[PDB]
């Protein structure tokens, strides 16, 4: 099979601690709502997270 390159990696990972990540944790997803549910259809409905990387 095939795998995408070392490019489209090394993007800005949120380097925070787990407690400060669970600190807000409630106002975070409650107002963004545009890429996440689309990303869920990109993962739940369609499998193979290799067409699903963007």
């Amino acid at each position: 099979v095939e795998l995408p390159s070392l490019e489209d990696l090394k993007v800005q990972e949120v380097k925070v601690s787990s407690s400060v990540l669970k600190a807000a944790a409630h106002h975070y997803g409650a107002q963004c709502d545009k890429p996440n549910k689309e990303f869920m259809l990109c993962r739940w409905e369609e499998k193979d997270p290799r067409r699903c990387l963007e």
Partner: protein, 67 residues
């Protein structure tokens, strides 16, 4: 002439046998038992249901993140 038997001063002590210090008998008991027992159940549903409210709150933070 110096013998014993005194002129007076006697009791006696009893040969009696009694100490009926009762004691809250006769349907007064089983009454403090049942009401305090349901009082403990009355203390429930204000804590378990309250912790159940926090239990959905705990699972809320898991579902909000993880996309």
């Amino acid at each position: 002439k110096q013998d014993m038997p005194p002129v007076g001063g006697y009791g006696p002590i009893d040969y009696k046998r009694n100490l009926p210090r009762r004691g809250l008998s006769g349907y007064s008991m089983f009454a403090v038992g049942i009401g305090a027992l349901l009082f403990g159940y009355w203390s429930m549903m204000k804590w378990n249901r309250e912790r159940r409210r926090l239990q959905i709150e705990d699972f809320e933070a898991r579902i909000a993140l993880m996309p």
